[PDB]
Amino acid sequence: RVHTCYFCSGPVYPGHGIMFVRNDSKVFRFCRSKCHKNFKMKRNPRKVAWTKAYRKAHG
């Protein structure tokens, strides 16, 4: 099916990203390496201008 990314918060299509699992058994479905690398840099998407998480959480 279509999955919603965690960083950019846009839609993802099959075989167009990576899925990552942390120690706490939490699953993240990244859409592109750009959001992949930003998340490992611990960059908050709510402060990042191109993410729909920003566009929904800041009005």
């Binding site: 839609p11 993802v12 099959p14 075989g15 167009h16």
Partner: protein
Amino acid sequence: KFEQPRHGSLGFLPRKRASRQRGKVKAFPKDDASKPVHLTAFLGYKAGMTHIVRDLDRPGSKMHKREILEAVTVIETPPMVVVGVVGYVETPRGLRSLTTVWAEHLSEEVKRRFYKNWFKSKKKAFTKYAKKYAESTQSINRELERIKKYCSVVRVLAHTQIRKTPLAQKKAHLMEIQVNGGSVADKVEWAREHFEKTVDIKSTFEQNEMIDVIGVTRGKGNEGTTARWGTKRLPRKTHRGLRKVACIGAWHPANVQWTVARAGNAGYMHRTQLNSKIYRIGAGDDAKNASTDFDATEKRITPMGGFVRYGVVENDFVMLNGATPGPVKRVLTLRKSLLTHTSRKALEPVSLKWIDTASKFGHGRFQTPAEAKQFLG
């Protein structure tokens, strides 16, 4: 002491440039007079490739009836126009082309193939042949009767409609396609009735067939033994360099053996890729050709933003399994498989669930422009 298998295949050398740009069919399927008259090869152009989602109907597998993501290659196949017929007679020295008969009218596409400078020429090709076909149709009749009476192999001269593809080239590609099935008379009358007419790929192939794709691979230029043959990189301490083969031979024989890796051309080579399954034979006029039964979502096969370095596929196309030799927009040959096969993988019918048409230029996140605007504000 320790040994390893050789690097490279001795059956694919010399590793030289192909003498041909277009993939030559070096073997046609064995003739069966019981089968009806049909063509055995089609000639297309590599539009690009994409990926699909498919439900796998493979009993006994770990992912039976579970979705798989599968890469597919898109080859644009506009109908080919039959313009001639050539007869071959079996002799104690092999096949010999007894005679060749052409159609009355040949388009500018195929007339360019007979010229290097079509712009300068007086365009005299087949002008006298067109005349002799007009007044003297008897001579044509004797030639085909000679083909029927003497020749045992019949091959149609068919050329592509290159103007219909978004290619800068205006010369068509003209090749011989063996006509298998029926008597020699059946093949010749089939060729006569199909002169100047277009043969589409829908008749030749049937959407679940294992074919052989033939073409020249993309040129990688001159390469060293590390990349041309896959040899081990020498250690960092190596004086004069390390991307080489250390020992190219022994003292005796006092020569370099042909089996030793050397630097040289690695690419632009004629290959025959066996067992490629057609996943879909799409029609250019159909506006649903990229829509599956489970997906709807009216869309065309061309990805959003166009095929990279190819254009927009507006004619009939074929969606094949895996990869094919050669870069994009190169002419490719699709022949019927010579070997008979009854494997479950090769026999299972293919039902597409979804076809990706996102931008292959970049990281395309939108299948269609419509829902691209819906996600955007």
